[PDB]
């Protein structure tokens, strides 16, 4: 306790607050006290001027305009008089940048300072160096199945929507994030992720590459589709339309790299002229949503699989569909992939099976080949075949890869890799040493 | 941590204490009695 006269307290508090010097209160500092306790520059100069006591000298008044009559209206300012004196662009920018960054965390960026190396080359342009050869003949050798996982990759805080390699040979690898992001990777187990892409509002649903390999296409739930420069990250073109766009492909044919084929939730499939950006050809025949589109023979035909439990095969750029396959039995075909020989299709039907449909003119599913060691109740997925058609690898909800022997039609191997459900599984087209998977846990793994 | 809840029962009643009086049978008498 203490019982200090309130008024003196006010005197000392204001004195210090205003000028910085106030006589110190202490009892036993020396057991006798001679000393001030302030910054003291003011104290020597100002001789302990009290706030209540008049200052010895006055300085530097600042004026505020006033009209006090009150006769005038609007006019009148009272003690409400706004100091006449007081009413960066350089900064105006940093703040904005910060805001943008924040938004992104909830505009494109470049990863790495490597840029163009040696002669002047795209990161995409050449691989040559990795053991083996990307140009490489189609069958590397009698194929192998992996045990050991090499790269986590990460980056994504959400499960990768999709994973795809690179036109020609697996030089680069490209991933789709539901955080509205797309990343490129060495694909050789190398740490570096090349250049990040950003520009979608909502999670990116699917992508496809330019057959030549320079352009790149993405489709997202934001109702937009973008064309990208793989060498700069530049959003070259954006394609409109109200419906959300599901799986999108780029015409494979050398003659018509230009045409986009986009499958829509709203039944239709639409061809887009890239140069015009205009609609070329609508396909209305399908009923219900469209899930996936492949090309059974390049240029000439493609197989669309739809929300209605049917397949529609078509010639290119012609609306009518020549062959329609449905059986009351088959539950659905969320993902369909085409063999490297161009001879077989493989659908992951919801019904927990894999169906082989002959690529050859007769699109008749064959009883001989079937796969049912794995469960996807109702998940989209990728099925791939080991080059040389020796093995088939399915990725499933439970998260365990299923490796089957095509020749012998039997689950040869199985892994419980991933702790969350796994989607796309890709066998490196040139190397038999490995496959690449992705799934909700947000990691890309190599087996 | 004392709650602001109340109850009807709790409210004041009979706040005065009836001390015994002298003819009622105050302790003073009792001490003296045989």
């Amino acid at each position: 306790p203490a019982h200090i006269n309130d008024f003196m307290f006010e005197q000392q508090r204001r004195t210090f607050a205003t000028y910085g010097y106030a006589l110190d209160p202490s009892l036993d500092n020396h057991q006798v006290s001679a000393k001030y306790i302030g910054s003291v520059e003011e104290a020597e100069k100002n001789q302990g001027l009290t706030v209540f006591e008049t200052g010895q000298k006055k300085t530097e008044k600042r004026k505020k305009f006033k009209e006090n009559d009150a006769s005038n209206i609007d006019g009148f300012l009272g003690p409400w008089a706004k100091y006449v004196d007081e009413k960066s662009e350089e900064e105006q920018k940093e703040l904005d940048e910060i805001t943008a960054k924040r938004q992104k965390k909830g505009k494109t960026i470049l990863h790495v300072k490597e840029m163009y190396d040696y002669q002047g080359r795209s990161y995409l342009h050449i691989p040559q160096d990795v053991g083996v050869n990307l140009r490489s003949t189609m069958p590397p050798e009698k194929c192998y199945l992996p045990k050991k996982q090499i790269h986590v990759w990460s980056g994504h805080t959400k499960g990768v929507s999709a994973v795809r390699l690179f036109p020609l040979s697996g030089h680069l690898l490209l991933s789709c994030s539901m955080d509205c992001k797309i990343k490129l990777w060495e694909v050789y187990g190398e740490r570096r992720c090349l250049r990040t892409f950003i520009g979608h509002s909502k999670a990116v649903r699917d992508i496809c590459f330019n057959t030549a390999g320079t352009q790149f296409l993405s489709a997202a739930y934001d109702r937009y589709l973008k064309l990208w420069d793989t060498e700069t990250g530049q959003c070259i073109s954006r394609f409109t339309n109200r419906k959300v766009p599901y799986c999108v492909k780029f015409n494979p044919d050398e003659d018509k790299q230009n045409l986009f084929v986009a499958g829509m939730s709203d039944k239709k499939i639409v061809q887009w002229d890239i140069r015009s950006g205009e609609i070329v050809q609508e396909y209305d025949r399908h009923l219900g949503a469209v899930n996936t589109i492949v090309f059974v023979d390049e240029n000439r035909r493609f197989v669309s699989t739809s929300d209605d439990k049917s397949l529609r095969v078509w010639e290119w750029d012609i609306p009518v569909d020549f062959k329609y396959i449905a059986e009351p039995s088959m539950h659905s075909m969320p993902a369909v992939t085409l063999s490297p020989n161009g001879k077989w299709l493989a659908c992951q039907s919801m019904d927990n099976q894999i169906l082989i449909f002959g690529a050859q003119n007769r699109f008749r599913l064959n009883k001989k080949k079937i796969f049912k060691g794995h469960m996807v109740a109702g998940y989209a997925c990728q099925v791939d075949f080991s080059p040389d058609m020796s093995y088939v690898i399915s990725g499933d909800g439970n998260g365990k890869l299923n490796i089957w022997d095509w020749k012998t039609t039997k689950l040869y191997s199985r892994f419980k890799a991933h702790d969350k459900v796994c989607i796309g599984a890709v066998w490196h087209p040139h190397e038999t040493s490995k496959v690449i998977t992705c799934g909700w846990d947000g990691l890309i793994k190599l087996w | 941590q004392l709650s602001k809840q109340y109850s009807s029962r709790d409210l004041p009643s009979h706040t005065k204490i009836k001390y015994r009086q002298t003819t009622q049978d105050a302790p003073e008498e009792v001490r003296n009695r045989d």
């Binding site: 607050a17 106030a22 110190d24 209160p25 007081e86 703040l95 910060i98 805001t99 965390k105 | -």
Partner: protein, 285 residues
């Protein structure tokens, strides 16, 4: 009544007006209502107010608002990395409630001024943290928060705006996230980790260039000093072998019975010892 405080919070003014609410807020840790104190620290300052109840401070020995130790001004993870992790305290829910209750009775029965069991430990110190402890008050800590209209470019209060107009901290820096509970328990505290990385670089203890060598290469002697300063400093350690002296470059070599003692004299000494009001610097060979 009256909070527990850092000297750094309380203010740089000796005169202070401080207000009190009976049950103002829940404490963000043991989650009880407790007396809360506000005050203005200074001219441009923020009106700080106690963040945690007095008990859980006495428990981990810390300021109420800062949660930095009383003596060291170090986040708790640090001074635990400095002595004793095994204090602990349940994080989990109803335990926390229970252990707090009991420990509140235990504290009630103490002399009152003592952070419970920790103080039995708290005396033995100085390993590192003294050397990483902060020296002077740090006022940049009480500045008002960053005006969030202006940081979008708009703020329409002009100069009046009590907030602060300047660039914020890039959310990239891991030092950003800083939960309260987290800083309290000493989990993955970014600040505390940074200070740990800073601790390591202290040139100090690895020594041992060569086996058995008790030779001490002493730089920065000075020509005021005598040897007798040395001996009457170093007889604490043990049986000296000898001392070599050079005053031309002012370096003094020393030799002890065991290498252990030489390591010691390094430790105790390095960038710490000063006698004759002049720093006595040490090196190996």
């Amino acid at each position: 009544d009256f909070p527990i405080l850092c000297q750094t919070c309380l203010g740089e003014n000796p005169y202070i007006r401080m207000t009190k609410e009976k049950y103002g807020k829940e404490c963000k840790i043991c989650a009880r209502p407790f007396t809360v104190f506000r005050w203005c620290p200074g001219v441009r300052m923020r009106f700080k107010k106690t963040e945690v109840c007095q008990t859980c401070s006495k428990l981990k020995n810390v300021c109420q608002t800062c949660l930095l130790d009383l003596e060291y001004g170090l986040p708790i993870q640090v001074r635990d990395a400095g002595l004793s992790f095994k204090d602990d305290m349940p994080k989990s829910d109803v335990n926390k409630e229970y252990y707090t209750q009991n420990m509140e009775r235990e504290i009630s029965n103490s002399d009152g001024t003592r952070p419970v069991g920790m103080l039995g430990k708290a005396t033995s110190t100085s390993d590192m943290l003294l050397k990483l402890a902060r020296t002077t008050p740090y006022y940049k800590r009480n500045r008002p928060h960053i005006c969030s209209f202006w940081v979008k470019g708009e703020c329409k209060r002009g100069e009046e705006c009590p907030y602060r107009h300047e660039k914020p901290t890039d959310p990239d820096d891991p030092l950003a996230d800083q939960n309260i509970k987290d800083r309290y328990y000493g989990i993955n505290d970014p600040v505390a980790d940074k200070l740990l990385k800073r601790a390591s670089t202290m040139p100090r203890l690895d020594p041992p260039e060569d086996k058995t060598i008790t030779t001490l290469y002493v730089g920065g002697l000075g020509d005021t000093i005598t040897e007798t300063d040395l001996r009457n400093h170093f007889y604490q350690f043990g049986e000296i072998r000898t001392i070599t002296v050079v005053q031309r470059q002012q370096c003094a070599f020393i030799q002890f019975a065991t290498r252990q003692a030489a390591e010691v004299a390094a430790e105790k000494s390095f960038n710490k010892l000063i006698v004759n009001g002049r720093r006595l610097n040490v090196k190996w060979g």
